Amino acid sequence: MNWTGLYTLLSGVNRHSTAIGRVWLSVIFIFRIMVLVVAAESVWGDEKSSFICNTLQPGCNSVCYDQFFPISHVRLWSLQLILVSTPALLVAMHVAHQQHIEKKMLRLRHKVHISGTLWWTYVISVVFRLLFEAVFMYVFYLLYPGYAMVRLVKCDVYPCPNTVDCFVSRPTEKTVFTVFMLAASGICIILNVAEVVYLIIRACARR
Amino acid sequence: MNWTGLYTLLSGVNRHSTAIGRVWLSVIFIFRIMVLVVAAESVWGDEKSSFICNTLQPGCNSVCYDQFFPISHVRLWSLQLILVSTPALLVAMHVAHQQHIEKKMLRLRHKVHISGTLWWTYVISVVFRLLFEAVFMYVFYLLYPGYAMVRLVKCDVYPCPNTVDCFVSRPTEKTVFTVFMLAASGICIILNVAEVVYLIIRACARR
Amino acid sequence: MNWTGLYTLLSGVNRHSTAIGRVWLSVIFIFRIMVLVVAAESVWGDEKSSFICNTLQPGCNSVCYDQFFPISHVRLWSLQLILVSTPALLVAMHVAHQQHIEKKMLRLRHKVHISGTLWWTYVISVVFRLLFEAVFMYVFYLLYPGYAMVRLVKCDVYPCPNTVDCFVSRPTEKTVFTVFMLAASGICIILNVAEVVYLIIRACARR
Amino acid sequence: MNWTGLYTLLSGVNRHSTAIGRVWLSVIFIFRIMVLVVAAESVWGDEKSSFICNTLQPGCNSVCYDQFFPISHVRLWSLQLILVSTPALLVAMHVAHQQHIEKKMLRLRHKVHISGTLWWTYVISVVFRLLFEAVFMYVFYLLYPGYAMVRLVKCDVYPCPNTVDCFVSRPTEKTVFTVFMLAASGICIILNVAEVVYLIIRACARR
Amino acid sequence: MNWTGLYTLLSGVNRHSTAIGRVWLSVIFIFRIMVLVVAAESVWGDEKSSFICNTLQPGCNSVCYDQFFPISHVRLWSLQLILVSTPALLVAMHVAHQQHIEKKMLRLRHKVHISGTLWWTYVISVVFRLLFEAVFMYVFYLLYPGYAMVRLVKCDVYPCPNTVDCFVSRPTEKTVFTVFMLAASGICIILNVAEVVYLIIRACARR
Amino acid sequence: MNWTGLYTLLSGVNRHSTAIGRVWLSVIFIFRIMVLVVAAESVWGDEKSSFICNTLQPGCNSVCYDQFFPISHVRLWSLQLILVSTPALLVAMHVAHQQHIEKKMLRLRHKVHISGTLWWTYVISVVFRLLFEAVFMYVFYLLYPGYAMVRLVKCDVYPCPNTVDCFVSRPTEKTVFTVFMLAASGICIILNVAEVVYLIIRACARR
Ligand SMILES: CC(C)CCC[C@@H](C)[C@H]1CC[C@H]2[C@@H]3CC=C4C[C@@H](O)CC[C@]4(C)[C@H]3CC[C@]12C
Ligand SMILES: CC(C)CCC[C@@H](C)[C@H]1CC[C@H]2[C@@H]3CC=C4C[C@@H](O)CC[C@]4(C)[C@H]3CC[C@]12C
Ligand SMILES: CC(C)CCC[C@@H](C)[C@H]1CC[C@H]2[C@@H]3CC=C4C[C@@H](O)CC[C@]4(C)[C@H]3CC[C@]12C
Ligand SMILES: CC(C)CCC[C@@H](C)[C@H]1CC[C@H]2[C@@H]3CC=C4C[C@@H](O)CC[C@]4(C)[C@H]3CC[C@]12C
Ligand SMILES: CC(C)CCC[C@@H](C)[C@H]1CC[C@H]2[C@@H]3CC=C4C[C@@H](O)CC[C@]4(C)[C@H]3CC[C@]12C
Ligand SMILES: CC(C)CCC[C@@H](C)[C@H]1CC[C@H]2[C@@H]3CC=C4C[C@@H](O)CC[C@]4(C)[C@H]3CC[C@]12C
């Protein structure tokens, strides 16, 4: 893996993307992937043996975990990663498609129109990224208000004969990784905002 | 991995495929693969320890799960993924075969016939994709009517001494991933419909 | 991975192989590998915790499973996959060897003899594939008469104090994958038959 | 993997980095990654079955481990690895970005300014690495004062009916790997200090 | 992976190796690796839960398994694979070393001596392979006289209070894979014998 | 993977290394890596369920294992592998660095000095390898005097109510792999000694 090719792959071979979206948010993307890989590997390993409920009747532990964790933190971040990777995947496919069409048309001004539609597609791609990041911020906030994961919980569900206390295995560890995910996502959000406004002022300065 | 080569691999080196089948449905295919990988990795992990039945006599839990889940969601999606990947795999092999035959014949108009049969093969390839997607829609509908997975079930099978209640571990989580699969498959269906009608009107406009 | 190189690898760089053996049976081979990978990954996972026997005395479950499943379905398919991959592996090594010998001899008609022996080697390679496929059809038939895997079994072995009932975890799921394996193998068989007769009529038409 | 390309990837294609930061601290980085991989693979495997508490009431073992190990050693080292990898990742993206901008501008003195800003960015990159390493030194010190991991601990938490004794599985083994991590991090720190002072005296000698 | 390069890698870039050692025994080597991978993956999985002893006192099962299986079948085959791979690894390094020395000397008859010593090194390489294969045949014979693995065993060791009966999980399955290993190793042996005699008669015909 | 490039990677692109250090000890290094991979994969799998103690009170088994196995055999070999890989890693980085410096200086006798310092660096690299190998020989000797691993042990630690007997799962198997590691390390030691004396007599013959 060479750095020039790796940067070429991460940048989505887009010429309209400036330094922020090809360097800093690319680094943020790689950092968030690495943290997610570590979290899935070790911290959130199977995420069920971590959650123990002080009970002997079967099924109470699973239903209590489901009630208090409707969507797991690591897999919510994985879905967030995929949903924010989709716009970059799409726009990279767009510029690659124009490369293929232009290469085909070479054997057989249009270039100005191609540049304009590529710019517009990239802009809405960043907008969709920002919207997806904001939606996952609100989803994470409503599911888990406190940034730090709760250590001990009280649950009383139908299979459970009475109210019981359940323990989260690594509330502090999962809190640290949650903080890194929240910080990385917030940085990605503000980088998207900077990208959007920077492109707008470039277009306004053009005219 | 470069974007030009990756697009070349995903497009199936087909010249008759237009923008929809080389860009948007390609992105949908990648998105569905990523969601399926996440679902198999974490949400549907072994899918048996997830399903607990409130009983002590052995064998009741397994048979109750088999009755209520004849085919697991994630592996049904995996079979759907393979069956819809097969037409693209086949047509890509077709155009590659014509490339090899034409390259062999170069050393030793036919090209018009090759283009015509490639167009027809690609059309029936998209038709077979659409039929496979529709069949899996009907199969998923009959096996699981409600889009949201049922949380708690009542089963009474021969090994079970009496009727017992069984709990699905993550009904909400599996519901979310089921919604994404249904939405992605529906998008793939309508993209196939658009591809079919677009090619038909192109051929009609040719004549 | 480019399509031209991937087709080149799958075709076994053989010029005497026609469209069937380089395109359709190649797709069938890939499809059977993918289904086998999925079956080993999830459906047949460790294939022992799937088989539960209603007993408490140790060793009865394992011996009952061994009696009713002398050779597991997925690993029987894996051995079938290897034994049918061996002829293609061998003939590809043959044509590669002739490439190396001809390249060595270039530095220092024989080509007609090389083409003839390559044709004969490829023919017996397809014949050996067809025989191996037929043998595994008969082996699978004798070991498992019904295509659908039995759901519940009755076993009485020496460690078992008396006759006990054992449950197969996913008889319907394993039935579906068995159907796909049987269909894929049958398609591979008839494709081999078509390849053999097609080459014979080509040679007869030559003379 | 060739040595020239691997060195090119590790050096971050930076011309202002001298021998220390491209050779010795690169080797230290690889060594720390390998030790971390081994520690996560085997020594710190799931790090929970390692920690056993002499009790039968559920939840006491997990909460006692959380209290005595707020952040696990291996994952703290993983976060340290990522946080010290981020500056090198960033500065490599910076020099790659200038390569792309200069290549784009070639088709259409600035080079002196580019060299100056690259030097400044690399300097603050090493400074941020040194600060991150020092912060993790202080974090590791406060969380775990003694370099050798404690073998046996006494915990008394609310779920635990009374004070109980818990055993760390491999205190000596984890001590050895902790010593290697501390030594490697300290070497990385002093290498960063040498890099900083060496660049400063180079700039002073320039003027 | 192209066939020409894969054959080049498997042949050990040796010009003195004829068709048998570059084609058939190469295929046998690949086949034995694939069977070993399958055996380690599934048939011999952890090979301890497979061996159950009808007892409750701990430690009797492990010591009984150790007595009746001093060296496991799959790992004995793995050691056999490595010990027979070592001569090919060594001789390939030899011919590569002569390539490097000749390339270095080009910048600055010896070639006849290089060819002669390469031939001798390859001959003793095949001899060492044959000896290693024969040794593992005798080792496997003495450890396990019968080719078919024993199904049920009687053991009485110090931890065991009295004589107990232990069950091998898959005696028939492990028998089938043992038969394939024995057949593949025997084929490799006779191929080595053919290689040795063929090279000898070539050298005698030269003089 | 081609043989020329693989040899180039293993040799550390060093011109002062003769046949022993580029061929035989390279093969020994690969052999030791393969044996270590097999040992970690299967023989030493998690190395805790292998060690069973005849007791019911929790924590006695873990502390008894820690006392009798302060450092596990496989991970001690892994640390030995890394510590002997470090000098080759370092010297390969050295020669690569001189390649980069010379390439940079080409655009802008020194070569004799570069060759001399490369020779000295390689010599001390082999010396450090030999010292590390000898240290691990002494460490392994003091931790485990007998080459064959002990089968049964007697331990009496504070958590254990009284003296108890513990069983090592595979003393014979681990003995065989220990013998291979000891033989491979000893061969690597004597190869280092031969390398050192050979280089010394070359330098003396030069002057
Ligand atoms: C603005 C920045 C962050 C854009 C970064 C682009 C990201 C989203 C792109 C760059 C490289 C891409 C990867 C390239 C190749 C593959 C292989 C495919 O089989 C699965 C998807 C996967 C793994 C892609 C996922 C999306 C990806 C990671
Ligand atoms: C219209 C769009 C979605 C077509 C996309 C083409 C898809 C179906 C094609 C593109 C690349 C293909 C992959 C290319 C190579 C391999 C390796 C082979 O050993 C298994 C199949 C596998 C993994 C192929 C599966 C089918 C595949 C994913
Ligand atoms: C007629 C058609 C189906 C022929 C298809 C050829 C098949 C049998 C060939 C094509 C590519 C081959 C693979 C190419 C490379 C390797 C790597 C080697 O280390 C193990 C075997 C393995 C994985 C081969 C197995 C056989 C293989 C899959
Ligand atoms: C001064 C020295 C230590 C600098 C060494 C540079 C390090 C920090 C650089 C060199 C190569 C880089 C790797 C190159 C490619 C990838 C793939 C990406 O998908 C995840 C990050 C990852 C794995 C990078 C992490 C950072 C990395 C390891
Ligand atoms: C006569 C025939 C069978 C010779 C076949 C040569 C065999 C023994 C050679 C060919 C390719 C070789 C492999 C090439 C590269 C590597 C990578 C290295 O990091 C571990 C060893 C390993 C995996 C080699 C093992 C030996 C090997 C498999
Ligand atoms: C004298 C002989 C034995 C020298 C052999 C050189 C050995 C020590 C060298 C040759 C190739 C090297 C590997 C090349 C690339 C990488 C990738 C990196 O991310 C981790 C280290 C790792 C895996 C290296 C470890 C050291 C290594 C194995």
Residue numbers in the entry:
A (entry chain A), B (entry chain B), C (entry chain C), D (entry chain F), E (entry chain D), F (entry chain E): 1 to 108, 122 to 220
What does the primary publication say about this deposited structure?
Connexins are transmembrane proteins which assemble into hexameric hemichannels (HCs) at the cell surface allowing the exchange of small solutes (ions and molecules of molecular weight below ~1.5 kDa) between the cell cytoplasm and the extracellular environment. Two HCs at the surface of the neighboring cells can dock in a head-to-head fashion, forming gap junction channels (GJCs). The GJCs connect the cytoplasms of neighboring cells and ensure their electrochemical and metabolic coupling in a process called gap junction intercellular communication (GJIC). There are 21 connexin isoforms in humans, with distinct tissue distribution, channel properties and regulatory mechanisms.
We used HEK293F cells which express Cx32 at the plasma membrane and form functional gap junctions. Both drugs inhibited the Cx32 HC activity and the GJC-mediated dye transfer. The primary mechanism of MFQ-mediated inhibition involves a conserved drug binding site deep within the pore of Cx32, Cx43 (this study) and Cx36 (a companion study). Mutagenesis of V37, a key residue located in the site M, renders Cx32 HCs and GJCs insensitive to MFQ-mediated inhibition.
